[PDB]
Design a protein around this ligand. Structure first.
Ligand code: ADP
Ligand code: ADP
Ligand code: ADP
Ligand code: MG
Ligand code: MG
Ligand code: MG
Lengths: 97, 433, 427, 41, 441, 64
């Protein structure tokens, strides 16, 4: 173990997390206050367009096959995914707004 | 309101400047010359204003620097807002990720739009008292408001949605508001005090609000659950043909019932002389449907090779396209028209000139390009403040002319210095000796 | 009332005995072409053969696309139809042949019926696993349901006392609103209270909707109608259109064959129309030979106004109508003739009538003479500007002077070419 | 009449305070922390 | 402390009333070109009308790029300058026209200036001031909240609207150690004082000092961005764990076809802000070097685009003669630019130097990089600078310095440059050897 | 500080282990711990009889 996994990777080479933090570091205190409306994030853009999407989204698919909507992400009653991984997927994704 | 503006090559023209009897005045709204061409342009404007004629292709033609783009800009300005007008350069349809036919379909769909108005509600008045009763570690909240206008007052109690809307958008006893029942949105209408008098009239107000949406945006919004974002990022394409006809049937139903109206528009393609023959073949069929707009094309090219083929055709277009289209001709200008154009440009550029300076400018513009003079005037007025005189004289424009070279002058200069200029074969005598 | 180069064609106007008259259905002349087109109409109406090929060839301004629209309209809306242009084949997401097959599978229709089961009523309670309680106008039932639609209901901000609508077959969830029984709880509540539904919570209905095979294939390969997070989260990962394996088509064919054999559906052959096929590549052209000689491919009709030309994709073979002899051998040819003076005049006056314009007889004579001089499409295009020019002088009719003024104002092909030949700088 | 910076009453409800400060108590807990309040000494 | 054929140009060296002397700003010769460039600089400084373009033509090594760099230096560090080459327009991700349009917008920037009023310091006691409830009630109803203030060079005490009760709900700093509040908007900001650094032997938060200066500060904030950044940020998503943000975190966000509706929206908002008097638009200058590498499609799109409202002033450089513009073969045109595009812009002419000008250039090159050259060696350098090329002579300085360093002599001698010329061959000698031999060289 | 966390003295109750010693093969010191450091130690708690390196630069902890 000492000759295989004692220290093999912490010798830099490729990179080290502290170096990334030093490089990905930020020298800004506060800027772009008008983020308000100058940027107008698309999360606000979608809800600002509520009325038109209610009044215009009309078309529907002509055909749809059930058991493929769930099978697309590889989770069914007979699937190759793990036991708790499948539930943790939507446990992390159901809380999404 | 008006948008940010800087002086452009076509900023001097505002409307076609025609007459009610379709008569061309010599000068009207930053405009001069090409009488019968303007009559034809007004005829096309009446066509698009009619709205009962679709799939018509007209073509303008003439020498370079003649006003074809100016004519298109003028007819677009005269047509006014609230009617979808689209201008597109020929090279913009050659996409590495989108089929040329698909891009043409997108342009055609963007060309026209639909107008829909719906009944809306609103409550607006001078808020007097606001009470919020929210429980800490409870289960419910409550709110009571006193809203009063000049002629009446009523007391209302809130529930959940308007409570959070009022809390998130800070309202006090002095700041006045508008609220919709169905929308639920709370909009500030300006403080009366703590500055305006008490709003008058009944609290309830029923109105209609109109909305204009171009056909391409309904086309894309129903394509995919994430297709709405394509209105901004544009990372869509190859919309299935089984959505276009569904949209067409839907808008046909909307027109039949009558609550939604459509507004046909104008699609303008400039420098169409460059395009692939497949685009022309697609255009041949795109004009034979009941939703095609009025399309106008421009090309300064005469007989030339058709891109995608080897043979030459007039204006560079295949004969079938000319067969189903009309040609509008533009003619060369003359000295007095050039003088009027330069005077208009100077007026909109707040540039003061002299009569002999204008004469020299007209002589240059008649022996060279009009744009040459239109830029020489700008460089001359730029020079003007070196001598601190708020005016432009003949020596100023002469110095500007000798300072900035002309196309003919540069061409004649390179006629005798080709040795020191990189030849087509690449050989060049860099060393003097 | 928008009119554009068509909509005056109301059909071939063929007699039940297969003899076409002179003027009928907004059509004049082309008796042989109309008779052959009606023969092909009955051919497709037979719905017994497949993979037949017809090409109609003739010069411009001969109503070839008009004839195609006429046969399409005569067939009616029961049969599937999909107009196409040759240039539309070339795409960047998928190979050209795959797009050709995709349009092949969209040109045959399937009429199917199924029973829709729904449950609607008032929300009474929400017991986690998930059991729900529904209250109707008179009935009341409790339902156990999959947690997926339970989470969807949570996302649908459904409150207590609300009324919802559920489609059992697809799990579609939609809230109508809240019952008016408990309505005036707030003075200015934003929620729109709606009356209680009438009838049993359980309801069964029948539908007769129609679909095409391409729709079935794309539905099977690409599910794009999900509701829970997993569904659209997965379906947004691959927005680009991809290829479709042939084994998927075979599986779809097997399932539709089973459906029709059982006796709840029947197959409807259709028509595929490609306009201006001269520009198609050689690879697609040799692919048509394999595609047509199949068991399910519908009938196809082509248009090409060409002569002794070289087909695109090669540089050696000169073939009639821009179609190589290999595709010609499996092809039927329909010849279209150019019109003449009196037919031109009739066309012009009919187009004027469908445009609700008043025209004076001498003006019609001038229009016919000019159309013979240059082209029919020229006069058809310029008649409306003549109408507006007359309207400017507040006249509802058309006068010869107005037509001459319009012809002065707007040019034609020959005059423009003559001007171009004698031009300073390629005007 | 719009004087002063828009006086807004901050009322408490209803006459039941296990801790005497209705708002200073929560502010103090946030500033100090109940977990760390046992190490003050 | 390094240079690459440039950076010795200190502006254009144009005096008042537009006059150019001989030696100034590291620039010698070509007076009229400098006068025209200064004219263009003044025109851009007018910030009145946009869309104008100009191209300049001349032989190779005539200082065109030097003129553009001098223009950029004269403009200053406020108005944006976007260097570019014709080949950089091509891409394998979007259309060429999209890249051209986005560069066009990247040329033009925008400056926003505003001022905020802030009260900050150290709070001796954080306690709201209770008062009688105006309505019939009970408990405690706050009328004001007294906030202590303490700063270096200025200290007061003030009270605020009790609405900050929610603001004081979560600060997690200390009992009034360091604070940040706003007057019109209120709010708070976590900022512990340094007086308690040593009370705990360990600490995972760096203590902050008390504010220095007046207890109330009216400080202004200035930001200079381009509209390209504006609508890129507008189009690009944001946020954290939500579906779109997490999907984009693994989407490799390649640029793709920013739509024109975002352009319209950003135009509207910047127009309403400049009308509001809070924003100031600064038109920029965009440089396309070696434009002969472009193509017909880009030329036509350029013709269309320069007619737009917000087209910045662009500068074009080329050194071709009676050449054929790419894409086509039948179009013979000067500098490989289609005549229609030529009709839309002016031309500036540059002229070759002479022996004395080359000698002065070599003198400047020697002076800038801290070198000493003997007069005879300098004259010889000028001799084969005229004989072969200026750039060869300019490049030869460093090897001569190295050879001088080898024998430990700061200056440069004639035999040194003779040895350097023997070692390093020019183009004419190289092609002479190439044509003489027959062993594939 | 590297490999010096020796022993954890949990406690009155709440915000406990507010002062624990540090050790090396040649050097020892007692250090007081605050609530923030208590929370930091709570994540991946260790017996502290080992030697663990923790960032004195206001960073985090790293098991050795
Ligand atoms: N009657 C006119 N009034 C005003 N400007 C005109 C007129 N005729 C031509 N011009 C000018 O001529 C210039 C060239 O016209 P344009 O159509 O833009 O290019 P081209 O004619 O080469 O297509 C335009 O900038 C326009 O301002
Ligand atoms: N018998 C007819 N009745 C009515 N319109 C006709 C008739 N024949 C030709 N046309 C008109 O001639 C035009 C030519 O039709 P189309 O086939 O699309 O072009 P082309 O004949 O040049 O291929 C059509 O717009 C159609 O309205
Ligand atoms: N008047 C001058 N002053 C200083 N350096 C110059 C001058 N003219 C040319 N140069 C030198 O020439 C080089 C630029 O050559 P340039 O004329 O831009 O080549 P091209 O003609 O290919 O654009 C620069 O490195 C610069 O040092
Ligand atoms: Mg033009
Ligand atoms: Mg046709
Ligand atoms: Mg250079």
């Amino acid at each position: 173990v000492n000759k295989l996994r004692c220290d093999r990777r912490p010798i830099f080479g490729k990179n080290l997390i502290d170096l990334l933090t030093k490089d990905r570091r930020v020298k800004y205190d506060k800027s772009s206050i008008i983020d308000n409306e100058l940027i107008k994030p698309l999360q606000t853009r979608v809800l600002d367009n509520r009325k038109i999407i209610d009044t215009f989204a009309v078309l529907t698919p002509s055909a749809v096959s059930l058991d493929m909507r769930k099978l697309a992400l590889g989770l069914n009653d007979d699937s190759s995914v793990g036991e708790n991984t499948r539930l943790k997927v939507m446990q992390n994704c159901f809380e999404v707004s | 309101l008006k948008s940010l503006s800087l002086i452009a090559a076509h900023s001097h023209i505002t409307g076609l400047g025609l007459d009610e009897n379709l008569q061309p005045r010599p000068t009207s709204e930053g405009m001069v010359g090409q009488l019968q061409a303007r009559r034809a342009a007004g005829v096309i404007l009446k066509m698009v204003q009619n709205g009962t004629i679709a799939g018509r292709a007209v073509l303008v033609a003439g020498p370079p620097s003649t006003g074809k783009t100016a004519l298109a800009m003028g007819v677009s300005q005269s047509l006014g807002k609230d009617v979808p007008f689209t201008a597109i350069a020929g090279s913009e349809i050659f996409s590495l990720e989108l089929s040329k036919t698909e891009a043409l379909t997108q342009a055609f769909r963007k060309s026209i739009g639909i107008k829909i108005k719906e009944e809306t509600e609103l409550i607006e008045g001078e808020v007097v008292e606001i009470q919020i009763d929210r429980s800490i570690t409870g289960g419910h909240k409550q709110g009571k408001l006193t809203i009063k206008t000049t002629d009446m007052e009523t007391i209302y109690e809130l529930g959940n949605k308007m409570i959070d809307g009022l809390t998130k958008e800070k309202v006090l006893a002095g700041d006045v508001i508008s609220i919709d029942k169905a929308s639920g949105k709370i909009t500030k209408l300006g403080r009366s005090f703590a500055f305006v008098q008490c709003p008058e009239g009944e609290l309830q107000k029923r109105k209609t609000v109109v909305h204009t949406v171009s056909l391409h945006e309904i086309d894309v919004i129903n394509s995919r659950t994430q297709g709405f974002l394509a209105l901004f990022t544009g990372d869509t394409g190859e919309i299935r043909s089984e959505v276009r006809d569904q949209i067409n049937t839907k808008v046909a139903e909307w027109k039949e019932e009558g609550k939604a109206e459509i507004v046909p528009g104008v699609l303008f393609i400039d420098e169409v002389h460059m395009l692939d023959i497949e685009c022309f073949s697609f255009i041949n069929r795109a004009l034979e449907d009941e939703f095609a707009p009025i399309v106008m094309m421009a090309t300064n090219r005469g007989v030339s090779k058709t891109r995608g083929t080897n043979y030459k055709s007039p204006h560079g277009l295949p004969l079938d396209l000319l067969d189903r289209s009309i040609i509008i001709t533009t003619k060369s200008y003359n000295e007095q028209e050039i003088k009027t154009i330069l005077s208009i440009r100077a007026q909109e550029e707040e540039v003061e000139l002299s009569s002999d300076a204008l004469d020299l400018l007209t002589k240059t513009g008649v022996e060279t390009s009009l744009r040459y003079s239109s830029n020489l005037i700008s460089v001359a007025q730029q020079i003007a403040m070196k001598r601190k005189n708020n005016t432009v004289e003949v020596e100023d424009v002469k110095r500007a002319y000798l300072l900035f070279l002309d196309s003919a002058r540069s061409v004649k200069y390179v006629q005798e210095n080709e040795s020191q200029y990189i030849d087509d074969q690449g050989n060049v005598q860099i060393s003097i000796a | 009332t928008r009119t554009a180069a068509h909509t005056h064609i109301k059909g071939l106007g063929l007699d039940e005995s297969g003899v076409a008259k002179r003027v009928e259905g907004g059509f004049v002349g082309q008796i042989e072409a109309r008779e052959a087109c009606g023969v092909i109409v009955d051919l497709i109406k037979a719905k017994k053969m497949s993979g037949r090929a017809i090409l109609l060839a003739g010069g411009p301004s001969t109503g070839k696309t008009a004839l195609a629209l006429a046969i399409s309209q005569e067939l009616g809306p029961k049969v599937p139809f999909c107009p196409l242009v040759g240039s539309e084949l070339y795409s960047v997401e998928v190979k050209k042949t795959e797009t050709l097959m995709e349009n092949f599978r969209r040109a045959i229709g399937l009429r199917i019926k199924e029973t829709k089961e729904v449950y609607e009523g008032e929300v009474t309670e929400l017991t986690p696993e998930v059991i729900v309680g529904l209250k109707s106008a008179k009935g009341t039932k409790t339902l156990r349901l999959d947690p997926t639609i339970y989470e969807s209901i949570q996302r649908e901000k459904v409150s207590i006392g609300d009324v919802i609508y559920i489609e059992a077959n697809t799990g579609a969830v939609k809230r109508v609103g809240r019952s008016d029984a408990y309505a005036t709880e707030f003075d200015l509540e934003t929620e729109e209270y709606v009356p209680l539904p009438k009838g049993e919570v359980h309801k069964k209905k029948e539908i007769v909707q129609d679909v095409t095979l391409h729709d079935l294939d794309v539905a099977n390969a690409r599910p794009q109608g999900g509701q829970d997070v997993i569904s659209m989260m997965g379906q947004l990962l691959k927005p680009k259109k991809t290829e479709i394996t042939e084994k998927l088509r075979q599986e779809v064919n097997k399932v539709v064959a089973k459906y029709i054999d059982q006796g709840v559906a029947e197959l409807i052959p259709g028509v595929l129309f490609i306009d201006e096929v001269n520009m198609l590549d050689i690879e697609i052209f040799t692919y048509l030979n394999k595609a047509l000689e199949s068991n399910i491919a519908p009938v196809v009709v082509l248009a090409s106004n060409r002569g002794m030309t070289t087909v695109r994709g090669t540089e050696d073979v000169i073939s009639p109508h821009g179609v190589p002899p290999d595709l010609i051998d499996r092809l039927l040819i329909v010849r279209t003739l150019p019109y003449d003076k009196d037919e031109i005049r009739t066309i012009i006056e009919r187009r004027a009538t469908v445009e609700r314009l008043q025209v004076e007889s001498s003006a019609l004579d001038l229009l016919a003479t000019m159309g013979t001089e240059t082209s029919l499409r020229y006069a058809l295009q310029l008649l409306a500007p003549c109408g507006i020019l007359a309207q400017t002088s507040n006249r509802k009719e058309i006068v010869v002077n107005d037509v001459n003024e319009a012809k002065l104002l707007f040019l034609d092909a020959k005059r423009s070419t003559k001007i171009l030949e004698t031009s300073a700088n390629y005007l | 009449e719009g004087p002063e910076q828009l006086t807004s009453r901050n009322f408490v409800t209803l006459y039941d305070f296990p801790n005497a400060p209705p708002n200073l108590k929560d502010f103090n807990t946030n500033l100090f922390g109940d977990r760390w309040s046992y190490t003050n000494g």
